[PDB]
């Protein structure tokens, strides 16, 4: 009588849809022109999509954290390669956000295009104060095409622009909307601190299994799968991403 | 700079706090009546606390699922064979649960039935048959209806699972609005699905013992998160209305 229904949409589907939105903002900002060396600062799990997509527009793309011709590095290898002068990127994309790459270090480079992700979302005094986006852009405005990648949920609250943040808040909001449907008993948002799984507990299998989870598990009297999916899609479409040129 | 903090309160702690509220409601209604035979209908995971506590105000307690433990068909076999005749009957099955025509066969001194309804829902309302389950014991025995709600909040049912979810997801949500918090993950899963339909007891135990909420934050907000969680638990009110 009481049915249990999993959405077809998994968490990874939402994360990828968000990553696609952010990349699309970036590709629109770069306006289709080639680089020969691209350096992307960030975490692999959130930065890879951009890495794989920009490799079509460059000869050599380094993704650096703190599987073809993308080179994957921790920042000490990258600093050593820069110190020895074996890297000099024309495109720099900083996706590190709060407490990310330091400005005194970015200032050492001379790219043609610099793009930095603004981590701030809805106003938060501590996040606003912790943010140093425009001090990261300061050394390049006058010498490079500089853009700030911004991502918000339309008329909704999110504390940051992180894909993870956006994923969580998206799915959780969706579960509450789904709860309000006629005949629904409850709706579980299936979420986990995935980076914790991959890098602290080092369990690749658990990571893959967990991120492949159905976004929402619904206890219901009625078949509400399609409607739930449409709710989920609406909440994803609330996400808007764009790069403002400085 | 960005810290990740787990609450000390786990999901199992929340489920038990709610279970304790409902049980203590039952206990207030059952007061010094003690029984010689108790039958509790419901799922093992949600019924066990009440069973375990009632075994003290009783001799032999059966928890029957769909203290000694039986599924409904073993129990029907014992009843037709005349090996059970309970003076206390507690129905915790809720929507689509034990049938009234089966209950009418029994003759308890006290009958308590759980109202699964929460905030109004036309379909849940139409599906509910609590008072049709009470009808055959009305005027025969002391009858009570167990009700559980969240004060001025939305919950579609009174089920412990439902209450646990709604409790934890908004606590997270409230947690999100704190100064310096980046995000808050409600760590929840369909546990009965893990235990009774995939049969993984170890995984069940691991998942239900998970910290309720994982917080990405700039500030140490553990205590304030805990107090938020406590407030949301205190929104839950449980009582037995006598018919």
Task: State the DSSP string of B131-158.
Answer: HHHHGGGTTTSEEEEEEEEETTS--SB-
What is the rounded distance in angstroms from the CA atom of residue A32 to the CA atom of residue B239?
Answer: 66
For an interface test with B, give the residue of A172, A183, A186, A190 to mutate (most B CBs within 10 A).
A186
Query: Are A146 and A194 part of one and the same domain?
Result: no
What is the rounded distance in angstroms from the CA atom of residue B147 to the CA atom of residue B241?
Answer: 7
What is the rounded distance in angstroms from the CA atom of residue A137 to the CA atom of residue A111?
Answer: 12
Residues near A64 by beta carbon (within 8 Å), at least 6 away in sequence:
A39, A40, A41, A42, A72, A73, A74, A75, A77, A78
Determine how many CB atoms are found less than 10 A away from the CB of residue A20: 13
| A116 burial level (CB within 10 Å; 0-12, 13-18, 19+) | buried
Q: With b meaning 16 or more CB within 10 Å and e meaning fewer, what string describes A218-235?
A: bbbbeebbeebbebbeeb
Contact residues on chain A for B161, CB-CB shorter than 8 A? 186, 219
For an interface test with A, give the residue of B5, B176, B179 to mutate (most A CBs within 10 A).
B176
Query: Are B228 and B241 part of one and the same domain?
Result: no
Q: What is the biggest distance separating any 2 CA atoms in chain A, rounded to whole angstroms?
A: 68
Count of domains in chain B? 2
For an interface test with B, give the residue of A168, A216, A217, A222 to mutate (most B CBs within 10 A).
A168
Query: Are B116 and B207 part of one and the same domain?
Result: no
- For residue B181, which phi and psi values (nearest 5 degrees)? -80, 130
Query: Are A163 and A195 part of one and the same domain?
Result: yes
Query: Are B79 and B160 part of one and the same domain?
Result: no
What is the rounded distance in angstroms from the CA atom of residue A9 to the CA atom of residue A209?
Answer: 14
Among B161, B189, B218, beta carbon nearest to A130: B218
CA distance B232 to chain A (A): 16
Q: Residue A228 corresponds to which tokens in the numbers above? A: 């739930």
Query: Are A54 and A126 part of one and the same domain?
Result: yes
Query: Are B96 and B169 part of one and the same domain?
Result: no
**String of DSSP letters for chain B:** --EEEE-S-BHHHHHHHHHHHHHHHHHHHHTT---S-EEEES-HHHHHHHHHHHTTSSSSEEEEE--EEEEHHHHHHHHHTT----SEEEE---TT-S-HHHHTT---SEEEEE--B-S--HHHHHH--HHHHHGGGTTTSEEEEEEEEETTS--SB--HHHHHHHHHHHHHHHHHTSTTEEEEEEB---HHIIIIIS--HHHHHHHHTSBSEEEEESS--HHHHHHHHHHHHHTEEEEEEE-
Query: The dihedral of CA B52, B53, B54, B59: what is its sign?
Result: positive
Nearest-5° Cα angle at A9, A40 to A54: 20
Q: What is the biggest distance separating any 2 CA atoms in chain B, rounded to whole angstroms?
A: 68
Task: Identify how the structure was determined.
Answer: X-ray
Distances (CA, A) of A113 to A90, A149, B7, B160: 6, 13, 42, 55
Q: Does residue B164 contact residue B157 with C-beta atoms inside 8 Å?
A: no
Query: Are B87 and B161 part of one and the same domain?
Result: no
B139: left (phi over 0), alpha (psi -120 to 50) or beta: left
CA-closest candidate to residue A177, choices A216, A208, A128, A148 = A216
| A29 burial level (CB within 10 Å; 0-12, 13-18, 19+) | middle
Q: What is the resolution of the experimental data for this entry, in Å?
A: 2.9
What is the rounded distance in angstroms from the CA atom of residue B111 to the CA atom of residue A84?
Answer: 82
Report strand pairing: B3-6 vs B213-217.
antiparallel
Range of the domain at A32: 10-154+238-246
Q: Does residue B118 contact residue B127 with C-beta atoms inside 8 Å?
A: no
Q: With b meaning 16 or more CB within 10 Å and e meaning fewer, what string describes B203-223?
A: ebeebbebbbbbbbbbeebee
Query: Are A185 and A99 part of one and the same domain?
Result: no
Query: Are A59 and A75 part of one and the same domain?
Result: yes
Query: Are A146 and A45 part of one and the same domain?
Result: yes
Distances (CA, A) of B180 to A124, A153, B122, B157, B226: 7, 19, 41, 34, 16
* Partners of A73 in the β-ladder: A64
Cβ distance B124 to A221 less than 8 Å, yes or no, reads yes
Contact residues on chain B for A191, CB-CB shorter than 8 A? 185-187
Q: Does residue A151 contact residue A23 with C-beta atoms inside 8 Å?
A: no
Residues near B59 by beta carbon (within 8 Å), at least 6 away in sequence:
B35, B36, B37
**String of DSSP letters for B8-22:** S-BHHHHHHHHHHHH
Query: The dihedral of CA A94, A98, A103, A108: what is its sign?
Result: negative
Report strand pairing: B61-65 vs A239-245.
unpaired
Residues near A219 by beta carbon (within 8 Å), at least 6 away in sequence:
A2, A3, A4, A184, A185, A186, A187, B161, B162, B190
Cβ distance B124 to A175 less than 8 Å, yes or no, reads no
Q: Does residue B134 contact residue B124 with C-beta atoms inside 8 Å?
A: no
Query: Are B56 and B140 part of one and the same domain?
Result: yes
Flag whether residue A132 sits within 8 Å of chain B, measured between CB atoms: no
What is the rounded distance in angstroms from the CA atom of residue B109 to the CA atom of residue B158?
Answer: 25
What is the rounded distance in angstroms from the CA atom of residue A1 to the CA atom of residue B71?
Answer: 18
3-state SS track over chain A: CCEEEECCCEHHHHHHHHHHHHHHHHHHHHCCCCCCCEEEECCHHHHHHHHHHHCCCCCCEEEEECCCCEEEEEHHHHHHHHHCCCCCCCEEEECCCCCCCCHHHHCCCCCCEEEEECCECCCCHHHHHHCCHHHHHHHHCCCCEEEEEEEEECCCCCCECCHHHHHHHHHHHHHHHHHCCCCEEEEEEECCCHHHHHHCCCCHHHHHHHHCCECEEEEECCCCHHHHHHHHHHHHHCEEEEEEEC
What is the rounded distance in angstroms from the CA atom of residue B148 to the CA atom of residue B153?
Answer: 12
């Amino acid at each position: 009588m009481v049915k249990t229904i999993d959405t077809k949409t998994r968490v990874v589907d939402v994360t990828n849809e968000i990553a696609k939105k952010k990349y699309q903002a970036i590709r629109d900002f770069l306006e289709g022109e080639e680089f020969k060396e691209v350096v992307i600062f960030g975490v692999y799990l959130w930065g890879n999509y951009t890495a794989q997509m920009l490799s079509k527009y460059a000869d050599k793309v380094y993704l650096v954290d703190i599987n073809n011709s993308i080179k994957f590095l921790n920042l000490n290898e990258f600093k050593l390669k820069f110190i020895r002068g074996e890297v000099n990127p024309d495109l720099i994309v900083d996706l590190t956000g709060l407490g990310g790459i330091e400005p005194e270090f970015l200032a050492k480079f001379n790219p043609k295009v610099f793009i930095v992700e603004d981590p701030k979302g809805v106003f938060d005094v501590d996040i606003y104060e912790a943010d140093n986006t425009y001090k990261r852009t300061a050394p390049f405005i006058e010498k490079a095409k500089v853009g700030v990648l911004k991502t918000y949920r339309k008329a909704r609250v999110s504390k940051t622009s992180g894909t993870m943040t956006l994923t969580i808040d998206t799915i959780v909001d969706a579960s509450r909307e789904i709860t309000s449907l006629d005949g629904v008993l409850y709706a579980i948002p299936n979420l986990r601190y995935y980076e914790g799984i991959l890098f602290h507990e080092n369990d690749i299998h658990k990571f893959l299994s967990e991120i492949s989870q159905p976004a929402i598990t619904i206890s219901t009297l009625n078949d509400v799968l399609d409607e739930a999916e449409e709710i989920l899609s609406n909440n994803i479409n609330l996400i808007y991403s764009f790069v403002e040129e400085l």
